[PDB]
Amino acid sequence: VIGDFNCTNFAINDLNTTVPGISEYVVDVSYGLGTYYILDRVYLNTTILFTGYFPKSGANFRDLSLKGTTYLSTLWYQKPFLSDFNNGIFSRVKNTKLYVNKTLYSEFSTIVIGSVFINNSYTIVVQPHNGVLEITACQYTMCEYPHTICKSKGSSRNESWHFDKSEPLCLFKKNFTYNVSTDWLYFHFYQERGTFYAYYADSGMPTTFLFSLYLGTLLSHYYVLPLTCNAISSNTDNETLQYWVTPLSKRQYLLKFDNRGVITNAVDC
Numbered sequence: 001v002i003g004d005f006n007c008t009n010f011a012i013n014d015l016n017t018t019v020p021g022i023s024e025y026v027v028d029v030s031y032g033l034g035t036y037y038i039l040d041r042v043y044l045n046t047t048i049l050f051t052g053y054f055p056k057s058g059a060n061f062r063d064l065s066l067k068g069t070t071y072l073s074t075l076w077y078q079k080p081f082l083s084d085f086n087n088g089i090f091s092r093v094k095n096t097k098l099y100v101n102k103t104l105y106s107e108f109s110t111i112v113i114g115s116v117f118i119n120n121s122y123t124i125v126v127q128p129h130n131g132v133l134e135i136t137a138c139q140y141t142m143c144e145y146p147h148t149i150c151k152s153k154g155s156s157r158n159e160s161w162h163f164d165k166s167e168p169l170c171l172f173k174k175n176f177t178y179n180v181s182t183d184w185l186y187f188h189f190y191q192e193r194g195t196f197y198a199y200y201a202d203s204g205m206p207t208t209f210l211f212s213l214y215l216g217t218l219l220s221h222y223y224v225l226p227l228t229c230n231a232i233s234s235n236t237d238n239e240t241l242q243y244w245v246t247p248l249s250k251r252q253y254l255l256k257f258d259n260r261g262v263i264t265n266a267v268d269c
């Protein structure tokens with residue numbers, strides 16, 4: 001279970017919905033995937049050897065995104081889904097673009113990073129709001145079975161992943177905009193000497209620095225909240241959620257910059 005507050009008991013079972021296990025996909029950084037721009041520097045028409053937090057080429061992505069309709073499986077809130085954070089993670093996220101009255105809506109899975117997920121520890125939450133990427137790191141009272149809902153098409157159950165009636169004390173709270181039209185979003189989340197770092201990019205594969213947050217504590221776990229939504233199924237609309245995650249580590253990369261400063265290719269030495 002995540003956290004320890006009894007938020008609800010409606011429609012909970014222990015069914016192993018994942019008859020097909022966690023889907024897997026092979027990392028391939030030959031086209032810049034998993035790389036990020038270096039500080040404020042600019043490199044032109046050259047190849048650089050750089051050491052940083054990058055995915056291991058040839059490793060596997062894991063599709064941790066989960067979609068439900070009415071029932072939540074207790075198995076969703078344990079290993080292997082609840083995963084260790086270690087140095088960090090690289091995330092490749094599909095932007096599930098739905099339509100209501102021919103109006104576009106952007107949805108994708110929420111991710112929570114923390115150590116114990118209780119109101120005496122800080123938990124980082126990255127939640128999309130249809131073009132607005134809300135990021136907070138707050139002492140949330142995380143539920144056993146946190147989950148988000150699908151604001152455009154609705155859901156059969158109310159949204160609940162924290163129970164704080166009063167506003168919890170916390171360190172960071174900001175909103176970042178992202179292009180709702182793009183099909184893929186990339187994120188780097190890693191920690192170093194008690195400081196949390198975040199990079200992202202909604203256009204192009206290489207990511208750019210978002211923010212850094214001092215925590216003074218070691219993050220140990222991350223989890224992708226299941227999403228329950230009436231739509232997003234082959235019986236109503238051929239759309240699916242995807243949240244690919246792979247571990248990060250300190251590795252040396254060969255980075256090639258084109259004549260305009262865009263990382264076009266990379267190699268994992």
Ligand SMILES: *[C@@H]1O[C@H](CO)[C@@H](O[C@@H]2O[C@H](CO)[C@@H](O[C@@H]3O[C@H](CO[C@H]4O[C@H](CO)[C@@H](O)[C@H](O)[C@@H]4O)[C@@H](O)[C@H](O[C@H]4O[C@H](CO)[C@@H](O)[C@H](O)[C@@H]4O)[C@@H]3O)[C@H](O)[C@H]2NC(C)=O)[C@H](O)[C@H]1NC(C)=O
Nearest residue numbers: 003004005006007118119120140141142163164165166168
């Ligand atoms: C920070 O986070 C912690 C958890 O990590 C929160 O602590 C929990 O707070 C909740 C809500 O106050 C507690 O739940 C309540 O516990 C009361 C005491 O439980 C005793 O009595 C019941 C019988 O009533 C026994 O079964 C039990 O074993 C204990 O002996 C209950 O009396 C409460 O019941 C009332 O509310 C529920 C809500 O669903 C109703 O269903 C009931 O009918 C009744 O009206 C309630 O269950 C919980 O015990 C706390 N856990 C711990 C470990 O402390 C903090 O509240 C939170 N603080 C902040 C500021 O966010």
Ligand SMILES: *[C@@H]1O[C@H](CO)[C@@H](O[C@@H]2O[C@H](CO)[C@@H](O)[C@H](O)[C@H]2NC(C)=O)[C@H](O)[C@H]1NC(C)=O
Nearest residue numbers: 127128129130132133134135136173174175176
């Ligand atoms: C960041 O974005 C969130 C989500 O849109 C904002 O939170 C909403 O703010 C409006 C207006 O104050 C409220 O009516 C909503 O109830 C809030 N929640 C949601 C889920 O929409 C938030 O105000 C924005 N700004 C900051 C600083 O967080």
Ligand SMILES: *[C@@H]1O[C@H](CO)[C@@H](O)[C@H](O)[C@H]1NC(C)=O
Nearest residue numbers: 004005006007008009010144
């Ligand atoms: C959570 O609360 C509901 C409603 O009070 C109760 O029926 C259920 O048994 C509780 N769950 C646990 C694990 O105590």
Ligand SMILES: *[C@@H]1O[C@H](CO)[C@@H](O)[C@H](O)[C@H]1NC(C)=O
Nearest residue numbers: 044045046047257258259260
């Ligand atoms: C880029 O570098 C290559 C190899 O040195 C060179 O042939 C080419 O003219 C350069 N182009 C620009 C625009 O710098």
Ligand SMILES: *[C@@H]1O[C@H](CO)[C@@H](O)[C@H](O)[C@H]1NC(C)=O
Nearest residue numbers: 008010155156157158159160
């Ligand atoms: C959702 O919230 C509404 C408003 O409080 C309530 O009427 C309804 O019963 C709730 N349903 C569930 C499944 O929580």
Ligand SMILES: *[C@@H]1O[C@H](CO)[C@@H](O)[C@H](O)[C@H]1NC(C)=O
Nearest residue numbers: 178179180181182183202203
């Ligand atoms: C948003 O993404 C679409 C599709 O990738 C692109 O055509 C458009 O120019 C982008 N707009 C902005 C402001 O990034």
Ligand SMILES: *[C@@H]1O[C@H](CO)[C@@H](O)[C@H](O)[C@H]1NC(C)=O
Nearest residue numbers: 232233234235236237238239
């Ligand atoms: C989804 O695609 C399959 C295969 O093309 C098709 O049989 C099915 O009717 C589609 N469902 C919807 C809701 O479009």
